[model samples]
Structures are given as structure tokens and as C-alpha cells.
Target: GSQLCGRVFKSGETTYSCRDCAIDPTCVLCMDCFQDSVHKNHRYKMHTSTGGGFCDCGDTEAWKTGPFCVNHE
Candidate 1:
């Protein structure tokens, strides 16, 4: 199971790249937070086409959910 670039999990689809989770200027919703360029705002407004997963950059505790963390508090 190969996880996408930004995607921290592997159970989800494959199109989910790190850009989905991480931040990037090329991305539709780019934010200035992480140096990796892929780690942008955790609260991105965009949604993934697969499961409508939102950008979760602010989320600090994502490892609990199989690496794919969300802002579910």
C-alpha cells in the first residue's frame, strides 16, 4: 500500500498526494506554514475528490488515525 505524497495513510485512494495534506503554492489552497512546501495549513478549504478530505495542517495529532489526521475535536 503506497501512500500518496501528502497523504499520510494508505487505505485511502492513490490519487491523494502529499499536496492534499501538505501545503504548496501550486495547490489551489496554498498556505505559509511548513518549509517542506507540502505541509501547508491544516485547515485547508479545499476538498479531496475521493472522500472529500479537507486539508488538515493545523492538526497536530494525526498519527492516531493511521497517519492521516484530521481536525476532529
Candidate 2:
């Protein structure tokens, strides 16, 4: 199975993922989420794929808020 199985962001867009996020190891966050206040201090890695992936934070609903899951707030 792919790390980006169920989640896919903008098609043909660039994105980034967290290599050592406390939330999820395979956590991938969009640029908007990556730059969000929640994950501003977290370490991340850059990844490019035509098909997007899900954020490890598990916040599929409020991805714009950063790497924190919807339940976080």
C-alpha cells in the first residue's frame, strides 16, 4: 500500500510531508497546512507528486489549519 493511499490533495500540485512529526510518521501536509501555526515549529520534508497525500495529523476536514487533526482544536 502507498503512504498516500486515501488522501490526495490538489492534482499536479507540489506538497510537503513530515519526516518526524509526533502526530504520524507518514504525515503529509499541503503547503497551506505545512505553513500553518500548528506545525510551524515541526520539522518537515519536501515531496513532489501529481497525486496528493493525506496529512498525518488526520485532520481531513480542516487541512488548512495545519498538521493538527480536526480533534486537536
Candidate 3:
């Protein structure tokens, strides 16, 4: 299924879904929009095929630190 944002998620693409965004609680964003000024500071759940599932690292540090969950690695 497609993301809540109407974007079709690809096999290797990294998608971000937020719960506290100004737009909507269930908003999902591409990497570009997720890094935009408005949503940069928000907590997000990152989804990627590399990890085989959703990651629990909801902070910026996880986004910058690596591609997978730090604790899991």
C-alpha cells in the first residue's frame, strides 16, 4: 500500500511518518520534505526496507547517526 501522503514507497527509499506534525498526525514524508525547516525538529518513525521493518529511533540523532536502529545493531 501507498504511504498516507499519497506517495508510492519504493523498495530502497527511506520514508518518515510523524505523529506530531502541524499538517496532520498521520503525515508521512519523503526525505526531502522531512528535512525541510518545518518538520526538521519533529519526532518521526522511520520506515525503510533495509531494516526490514519500522525503526524505533524517533529522533534526529538516529536519522543522522546511521541507516538502522542503533540499539538493534
Candidate 4:
């Protein structure tokens, strides 16, 4: 119920995704993924989640050059 191939956060959880890597605003990066990825060096913004948002950390379709995280790409 928690291991999302692409993570998803419910409301109240903070969303701080890399804007530079994100092709769409839906792109999300969890704490674990962000640190493991190169996207951490890019410009990122925080978002307050309400649910149904897809964390595009590994989804190549959501990023411009694809996943920034080593674990994903």
C-alpha cells in the first residue's frame, strides 16, 4: 500500500519536485529519491499535495531528459 513505483503522496505530505527536471507539474520527488538523483542540483519548488498527483521521479515521460535519479534511470 506504500511502495509506489512512482510515488504518490496524500494530502499534508510535502511535495518538493525539481522544476528543471519536471516536464509536467505533476512530477514529484520524494526525500529518498531526491537525494539519490542528480535533480537535487536543479531548481525545485515545494508543493502541498491533496492526492492523485504522480511522482515523476523515474518516469522518463515526465522529465525532459528523463529521470534524474540514478536509481530510476
Candidate 5:
């Protein structure tokens, strides 16, 4: 089963879904979806630490849910 870190949203109505990508490669588990939609009204600032530059998320709000890295807008 996939474990969810949590879910939150930005003011722009963009949903930030956090989950264990290992358990759910797509990170689209029912829990993550439900939580993401449920809390789709609050602004979120998810924190993460990533290794290597390949998985680096740069200047994108959609990448905030990534396990590796997220570039803040």
C-alpha cells in the first residue's frame, strides 16, 4: 500500500499531493487524491530534499509534490 505524506493546495487552486512514490509509482493513490481534493482550498508549502540534479524541479509549482525536489514559485 502507498503511504501519503499529506496534501494541500496553493492559492491558485493547484493541488499539491504528497505520497510515497516507492509504494505508488504514480503517486496517485486513493488517499492522496482524496486528500488533495479535500484540502484543495488552502495554500501549501511542502518541503523536500533531493540528491542529484536530474530530478531537480525548477521554477514550477506543480513539482512541489515531488519526493526529490520542488522549485518554489
Candidate 6:
């Protein structure tokens, strides 16, 4: 997947974050991309999306292999 769904996440919103992609605070994943993104062997946590969190999908710096959803590909 390679969907660059950089949807800014607000506090209290449902979102996910992969441990392997947690290079920074902005490495957040919105449901738009999280629901479609794949984490075959990665560790991900789901909870209230924090404020100022930017969807890290497709981020080359924030994530290593967990880049983008299918749409952004």
C-alpha cells in the first residue's frame, strides 16, 4: 500500500500507529489509511488520535516499510 492519506488527526478520534513506524510524534495513521494499510508483521496500537498528529502513511522518513496505503501506491 502507498496511500498518502495525510489526514490530520484530532484528539479523541480513532486512529492507529505502528511501532516500527513511530520515528516521531507525527507518525500517526488515520482510519482512512489504517483500515486499508497492511501490517503483516508489524506492531500497531489503536486509540484516540492525538492532536497535531499527521497521518504517516507514505512517509519516507517516519516509516520504514509501513509506507502508504493501496490508494497512494
Residue 63, candidate 3: alpha-carbon lDDT: 36
Q: Report the lDDT tens digits of candidate 1 across residue range 1-73.
A: 2222333422242222243443342232212223233334344343333443343333434322223322212
TM-score of each: 0.22, 0.47, 0.42, 0.72, 0.19, 0.70
lDDT of 3 by residue, 1-73 (tens): 3222234456787877664542433334556546643445556676664433332233343333232222222
Tell me how many clashing residue pairs each candidate has.
Answer: 11, 1, 0, 0, 0, 9
Candidate 4 structure quality by residue, lDDT tens digits, 1-73 = 3333567677777776777878766677777677787776778887788876656565667678547567765
lDDT of 5: 0.29
RMSD of 6: 3.8
Q: In candidate 3, which residue pairs get closer than 3 Å at backbone N, Cα or C atoms, i.e. clash?
A: none
Instruction: Report the C-alpha lDDT of model 2 over 5-57, residue by residue, as the tens digit.
Output: 23456666666665454444444665654665355565766766556455444
Q: Which stretches in model 4 have alpha-carbon errors above 4 Å?
A: 1-4, 66-68
Residue 44, model 3: Cα distance from true site in angstroms: 1.4
TM-score of 6: 0.70
Better of 3 and 6 by TM-score: 6
Which residue pairs come into collision in candidate 5? none
What is the per-residue lDDT of model 6 for residues 30-68, given as tens digits with 9 covering 90 to 100? Answer: 777777777534788776864766677777777767577
| lDDT score of residue 40 within candidate 3 | 53
TM-score, candidate 5, is: 0.19
